[model samples]
Target chain A: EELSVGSDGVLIWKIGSYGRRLQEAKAKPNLECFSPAFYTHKYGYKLQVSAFLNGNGSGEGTHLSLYIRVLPGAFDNLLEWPFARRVTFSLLDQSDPGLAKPQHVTETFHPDPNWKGFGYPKFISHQDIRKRNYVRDDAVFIRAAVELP
Target chain B: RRELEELSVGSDGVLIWKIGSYGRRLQEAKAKPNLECFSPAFYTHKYGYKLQVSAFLNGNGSGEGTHLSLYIRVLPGAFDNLLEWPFARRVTFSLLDQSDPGLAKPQHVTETFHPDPNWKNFQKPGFGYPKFISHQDIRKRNYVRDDAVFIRAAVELP
Candidate 1:
């Protein structure tokens, strides 16, 4: 998978591995992501996810995971999968150009489990992913849509 | 009773007569030696008349010669209106020489008539209009002549 969109409000997901060709993934996950699509054009609709991971073996401890769903009609009745989320993995070099300097990984929930439900949802992570090796590899993952009050 | 022809006591003192009714003498007329005549009593009067005379310079190194005689008589019916007369009647003569004994008095050495602006319209509640001659008519036609001398001598006794 290779999808890039950035205008400084970043979002780049390029993954390659299971049989490659997603641009020869020998390890290229460069995701500088931010979502909430500007908070559904300002308060009225929301669904966001931004996950990242980049790799290239330099102590190879790469491990990334993320999953979230809400696309059936993307929400008219808005079904469910209310939980499971994760994306934190890193490792980028060539003077740190995992798509323009990426660092800061880990945070897909830990000590933050209150999902109590309502139309507002929020999740942020980066809680000490093994005491820094550039925190879980190479970092970058941002999600948004937090416009209340 | 006095008839002495040929007894001529007149020596070189020229004599001629008839300018009025007097023996008019000439030849540098002399005849005044301490002659200080006085006349103010009824020398013709009416509502106007005045006269004053003073004298000095007898010897004291300043006397040369001096003389003066003024006589005015205007009463023939006293101005019945010769257009109310009085157009010219000013005669003053002064001579002073006390030679500063702190300016020893007498000062105006000769004047013939002064005081003007038509004499301040004669100065008594009057100022313009041909209506002058007042201050009691110039104090009743004033006149002052304190005959002092070094020169002034010519009005032969009139």
Candidate 2:
């Protein structure tokens, strides 16, 4: 119950944040993709997040969007993926237990023969993250959990 | 690619289906002597979101009968980040016409859930019908092929 799921259950990965990376990301918002460890051989998938000093191109203020994508991995042969599951993005909210709602969103990852990926273009705005006290020490913690009904 | 391409969008929204898991899924249902199998949740047209399907065989009893029971449910958690609620849309369920059409054009019965009167049902984040399909007529057809079953959910615009 404790282990978070995504790309495949128990195969977790984390990113240590930097105010500088944040700064650079907001400038280009070049769409950073990550390869996290999974239960099986890591062949496909890139966890997409907006990195740098700025924000994702939501362009309004400072909103960060996250995405999950397929990177032409070995899982391609697994077929259909039966990926009839849901993916979750959670922002750790221990900093302000009261006002911190902690940003999160769930989207269906339909696995089939050949599909690109799925995600939220604007998962959460940076303003809300700070106003709620979710970001402290200039670092924000996040994780993904996938589950079936 | 054929498999992914086979997945389609009807005039409604994302149409989800299970091609041939009849006997297997049905047995799992009776493993409970009676149980409900729900498909993973999906979204519709960006307006009404997060939809699921539930089906039961050998009747839920409760006296529902000795037939199959199919249902479509909209869960409550959809309310969490919803941009809107109770958006009127139609829900349609079909046990595919796997029958060979060479003889005649296959005809299937389809019913769309109430959009207005049932507004509250959608408002609270719940299901509209518990008996969308009946077992009496469900089993006597070619809908089941090669020991398998086919079910589809089509979300239509009101």
Candidate 3:
């Protein structure tokens, strides 16, 4: 499924009923869910973001793990190899828009040579989850934005 | 024309300032206690806060003749208007020890502070520790290698 993309080509992935989704994830080990596939642009490289509601591997039970997976795209032949572009994942705050000076927590990284998948097991700590405006109405939003070299 | 050296900030908001010729620095400090060396300007991010670090090898004020004085300055930036004013963030300073094999055994002198809004450094100049690390402490560890010392400044992101 395709998702909405913002001005800077940032794709938004909404995790509704975050509380319930988290509970379901902890029921199984290494359970991961994927966001809708998105492209850097209309005809750019395709990408997808994944998440582990209850943390993953080393960060198990402590952090909310997040990852990125690159899918073969129609424009692959014209694109550079090793996926050098920077991909940033921001856990959006639900606080009032511009009026609120709250900053979104974000992590950015480039791809590794061994594999196309890149991620952080300790994306965000569970203890800090209740401290910010990140969660509202049992739901949360994640934004993935790709940067050009 | 010769171009200026390009400086970069760590993705983690950490900046390492290496001062070579530790012996020469100490000599200069003895001759002129007021002399200071500055690190190249760095950004917390491409568009984040702009900052610089200055060190007094011989020491300053109470730290003079006994310790190293380390400080951080907030420089005007293109994005200053977009940033929070008065520089209210945790700043950490570290004097690293370059010990190998027993790497974990080496001790590093580190200090952290939350900037006070009342301080004038946020609006201009800078603020820091006069006795960041003592002269005796530097000699006690492998903090200096090949007559060089490395100082680190890390600005925390909320």
Candidate 4:
């Protein structure tokens, strides 16, 4: 609860180490990271961040690939489920106070039986992270948000 | 809030766009990722101004065999009145599968950005991917069916 998630329904993922995370990402075609489940148990859903390291596209060797997926967990399986909303993916600059420029990616989610997610295949660059303060303490903070209309 | 306009691949809506000679107006921007091309005012945004796709190849040099990138962009003077400059929305760009049932899965990307007077607007107008679909994969899959391409740029509300 230290990092308060807003009505937008946000999740911040604190990852340790650029080297290891990157390798794990490469090892797996797509590494799925989740947030501590959110919602009032009724309208609840889990945020899924699928990091594709081998490159979601051109981000293969250069940038970090990322995606946001909405998973229905607590299942009040009523209503339209996820409906539609804009989702945001931010690669936080753990230390942006005058230094780093954080990376931002986004997508629109539409739930049918459920909703699917979308985002930048290459969200951030490894070179930028290694050369700068993006990865502090060898850890990176990646964030996702589902803004309410 | 805006509702996204959807189009079926290979439909007349996008058919004209594909052959509209978008390549004729293709202008490259040699910046950070080192690539960008302007689609000759082929697409339209919610605001009504014709739009362009400024994309980076290989996901901005991150990986080449992995993806083909693209974004929604507009010239400074392109937008009129209330809709000027930094275009914001859940702008989604998709590369449709030309036809092979397998390659029919479209590759998509969306992002948000509203130009603020204080930020770096001129430097970065809109957001997009350099490498959207993997080169061999898109081809192997068939997004480029019959030596033709189908793409859709939609402005959606979050």
Candidate 5:
């Protein structure tokens, strides 16, 4: 029997605010909001994200956030179930006693496409959705792989 | 004592006025002292006014009906110093149509509270007095001669 792994596997990702406003501002201009970062281990995927502060609130600073979506298409009949995740990150310095600590937060499940029907996806609002008021300063990255059972 | 002015009919089959006196009233007491006092209550005060026009159609026949209302507002006399003394400073006009008798829904055609097109200089001199205005269309709706059309206007009072 020829085993068939579906080619419909897709991933979506996004990232936004978490406590460090200044770091987000500094990182936004040069950082790419979304990336496929790393894809390995065919059936199972590994996702990695990091937030780096270039300087201690003095030089060019940076902050990063990450989100991911995994839609595994095992067979032609089961093509619609998608899993989503959101993660936030900030820089930490161990040597400096006053250095900020790193925090990791996660959310699971795809958010509603139509906001009116279901609540907004976690962390989706952190981006400058309106493009008005203050601009958003953050980074997002995504990656995915498929496995056969 | 003031007297009624000449009454004339409008081309639209409605009555209108060109000039009329702002009347006044006086009363006498029959008490022993026979006290008398003059009352200014009967005088026609300047006010904000509005008119609503409607077009009613029933099957093959159609007719237009109109309603008129008046309103007033009070302000310090200084506010009127620049304009012709005491005059109605605000006015509005609107049109509504309720052609669908079954639906009973009235749709607005136009509503305006600003100076009439004929009053060229009304707004040039200064900011025109405040007024609320609206209009509607009723041409497509079912209506009868006896159907009541509504008009309303309001203003500040002393």
Candidate 6:
């Protein structure tokens, strides 16, 4: 699906049909859904985000897996090498305001060249998903942002 | 490119204000003290305090003809109703050093100030240093790169 990039260089990818998607994911071991290519900043490094619905590697069957991949970009010549920067991933809670704030699950990482991508396999557990408003109306929102120092 | 209008506030609450054609801006400021360059409007956080930065290449007031005068302006925000009044926060200004990697460490000139509760600028408009950085000091370092200069403004909310 398409992704929306904000003026501040944050991309929000909405994943819908949560239960149906999980059904297919459970049948497959390492299935991954990819996001459209986006920038860390305007004309900055090009990158993509991926999600493992049924989890992967160490987190299989227990948690959701998230990752970020660095792609050769048009502005690579103007940027620093090895793609060093802070990347944050967030799972939004679609809850109506009551007496508390929406509880979101977030994870952060810095990139290096050991691999083309980096991420956490155990991003969030399946039990935690049911504990809050993380999944609502059969859809969930994920945000990937690059922070400037 | 389409990136020209894009403005991003750092996680540290700093906004990078890029000034292009430094020579022309300096010349114009020398010719007309009233002319000033303004930064794109930004926020301390998303929907946080709304603000902008203003710069006088040649100088302003006490800094006239000798320094690069800089100031911060408070603007009406969509989320202002939920924010604290009188804007009692710390504001900082930094002139970046653009020296290449093969040379010495780039020393950036930085200055900061706390707003006064009684000052109208906190609630209305401009508030800052008249002599932010001297013209001579700018030339001493690699502050200007390819006819452009980068200034960073950090608004702190404690």
lDDT tens readout by residue for model 2, A1-149:
11111233422233446456666565555546453433222343323333222434463236665665544444557634534445666654433222334443233444444544455556667666665434545555555555533
Worst 10 residues of 4 chain B by lDDT: B1-10
lDDT score at residue B106, model 2, on the 0-100 scale: 74
Global lDDT of each candidate: 0.25, 0.51, 0.78, 0.49, 0.27, 0.78
TM-score of chain A of each: 0.23, 0.60, 0.89, 0.67, 0.24, 0.89
- Write the residue-wise lDDT of candidate 4 on B1-158 in tens digits: 11112111122222123422323322222223455444445324322334456554434555433566665555432123223333443445667655545755444333333434443532223455555666666556545555545566655433
Sort every candidate by DockQ, greatest first. Answer: 2, 6, 3, 4, 5, 1
TM-scores for all candidates: the values are: 0.15, 0.46, 0.53, 0.38, 0.17, 0.51
- Candidate 4 lDDT over A1-149, as tens digits, reads 31122223665566665677678867875465544444422254545666654566777767777776655544446644444655667665543322334443334444334434466766767766665445666666666666665
Each model's fraction of native contacts: 0.00, 0.00, 0.00, 0.00, 0.00, 0.00
Number of backbone collisions per candidate: 11, 16, 0, 22, 23, 0
Candidate 5, what DockQ? 0.01
Tens-place lDDT digits, model 5, residues A64-118: 2333333232342433323223222212111211232312233334334432111
Candidate number with the higher DockQ (4 or 6): 6
How close to the true structure is residue B44 of candidate 3, measured as C-alpha lDDT?
81
Docking quality level of the chain pair in candidate 5: incorrect
Candidate 4 TM-score on chain B: 0.53
lDDT of 5 by residue, B1-158 (tens): 21111111122222222111111110111121222121111112221111212211111011111211222222232112222323333433332343565776655433435434354343222122112221122323421113433332222222
Leading candidate by TM-score? 3
Q: Pick the candidate with the highest DockQ.
A: 2
lDDT of 2: 0.51
The residue ranges of model 5 lying beyond 4 angstroms of the native Cα positions read A1-20, A23-63, A68-79, A83-149, B1-101, B109-129, B134-158
Candidate 1 chain B least-lDDT 10 residues: B125-134
Residues B80-106 of candidate 3: C-alpha lDDT, one tens digit per residue: 544566777799999998888554776
